[PDB]
Symmetry: D2
Subunit: 108 residues, 4 copies
């Protein structure tokens, strides 16, 4: 319930990063920033992180498993953000969240 | 509670239309389909319709007001979808939902 | 994307059932209807089903896995709804969704 | 901008407070904490705050109006949390968010 508020805070920060970037910077730049695979990864990751926050906040039985999946979502989205100019901060945030997701998924 | 299940069904259908089209057809086509104003309208409308469904399902005090706003979101999004090839079904759905939103917002 | 529109429709129906029942019938009845384990199962299942719908609608890479988990959520919530006579429709809906979740997760 | 990231941060904090309290402390205590009007206000307010954050993050045209409504949700939920033991922090947070909502709705 300390590593927990940590994972919640991290997943909400990452939700903000990925959803906020997609719908502002990426949408406004166009080009590679809105190519299906990259953009879908961003929206997918943002929803996973927001859904993970929710499941943790209600102390769901499946919170630990959901965060395990959120770690994969975060990792996949980091890879898709590495190639792009301006997306290196997002990719770092996603890798940071992925670590947090993995830590709390392995505690009880 | 009949006009109610109607508004819920309509807003969920419209959520599916706008969010599903944005993230599949629009994202895959590119061009006009991902221009910021049009795309933002689609994502905005989808979330409004999904949020309206939620507030109705929990019999929120603000459900009637939220649907009033959802009607405007739906109308605005219909206008943004009129110009675009393959978006005519979406635009019709948005106008249909806007009507449903307006009916239930004016009853008890 | 036929078994897919099926899973979407089912998960949205089940979201409606579990969230709508929790916040209306269960909240209004009280008693066993708002006991933590039962109620948390309901809210948890509702969010899983709505999250699953979303991930499927955007053709997320992880949609198959998420639905696998949604099947377990639905099954667990069905068990928690069995003991109350007024929750029999909810429990059936959850078992129906769990089947749909399992079909599409294996495609 | 600045007052914007402020409203987002505040609405997400308030979402955390109201949803996390409802589903933990309130659900676990029962009694007044799960009476329909109070509990519905908490869930409603949490969703309003989370929905407002979303609409702001995507720079929706309707973000200003939505936050206006979130301010009312926050105020109403604060009133419903004032009476209850252990809900004093929640009520303060709701009043704080309501102010933030009102600032950005007017800028
Ligand atoms: Cu997390
Ligand atoms: Cu977590
Ligand atoms: Cu995350
Ligand atoms: Cu992120
Ligand atoms: Cu970008
Ligand atoms: Cu991007
Ligand atoms: Cu994420
Ligand atoms: Cu992400
Ligand atoms: Cu996460
Ligand atoms: Cu994640
Ligand atoms: Cu990414
Ligand atoms: Cu990402
Ligand atoms: Cu990222
Ligand atoms: Cu990213
Ligand atoms: Cu992330
Ligand atoms: Cu994470
Ligand atoms: Cu996580
Ligand atoms: Cu509606
Ligand atoms: Cu409505
Ligand atoms: Cu709608
Ligand atoms: Cu729509
Ligand atoms: Cu389109
Ligand atoms: Cu579009
Ligand atoms: Cu729409
Ligand atoms: Cu809409
Ligand atoms: Cu609507
Ligand atoms: Cu609408
Ligand atoms: Cu639309
Ligand atoms: Cu539209
Ligand atoms: Cu539409
Ligand atoms: Cu549209
Ligand atoms: Cu709509
Ligand atoms: Cu509507
Ligand atoms: Cu509506
Ligand atoms: Cu499903
Ligand atoms: Cu389901
Ligand atoms: Cu359900
Ligand atoms: Cu019940
Ligand atoms: Cu119940
Ligand atoms: Cu469910
Ligand atoms: Cu369920
Ligand atoms: Cu499901
Ligand atoms: Cu599915
Ligand atoms: Cu499920
Ligand atoms: Cu279900
Ligand atoms: Cu259940
Ligand atoms: Cu259920
Ligand atoms: Cu059920
Ligand atoms: Cu149930
Ligand atoms: Cu299902
Ligand atoms: Cu599913
Ligand atoms: Cu705010
Ligand atoms: Cu705001
Ligand atoms: Cu708020
Ligand atoms: Cu709150
Ligand atoms: Cu409480
Ligand atoms: Cu409470
Ligand atoms: Cu609140
Ligand atoms: Cu709130
Ligand atoms: Cu708010
Ligand atoms: Cu608020
Ligand atoms: Cu509140
Ligand atoms: Cu409150
Ligand atoms: Cu509060
Ligand atoms: Cu509260
Ligand atoms: Cu609030
Ligand atoms: Cu606020
Ligand atoms: Cu606000
Ligand atoms: Zn999983
Ligand atoms: Zn309004």
């Amino acid at each position: 319930s300390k590593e927990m508020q940590s994972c919640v805070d991290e997943c909400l920060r990452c939700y903000q990063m990925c959803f906020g970037m997609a719908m502002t910077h990426c949408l406004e730049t166009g080009g590679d920033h809105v190519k299906p695979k990259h953009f879908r990864a961003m929206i997918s990751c943002a929803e996973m992180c927001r859904n993970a926050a929710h499941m943790m906040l209600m102390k769901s039985p499946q919170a630990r498993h959901i965060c395990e999946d959120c770690a994969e979502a975060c990792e996949a989205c980091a890879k898709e953000c590495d190639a792009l100019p301006d997306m290196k901060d997002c990719a770092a945030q996603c890798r940071r969240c992925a670590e947090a997701c993995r830590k709390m998924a392995g505690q009880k």
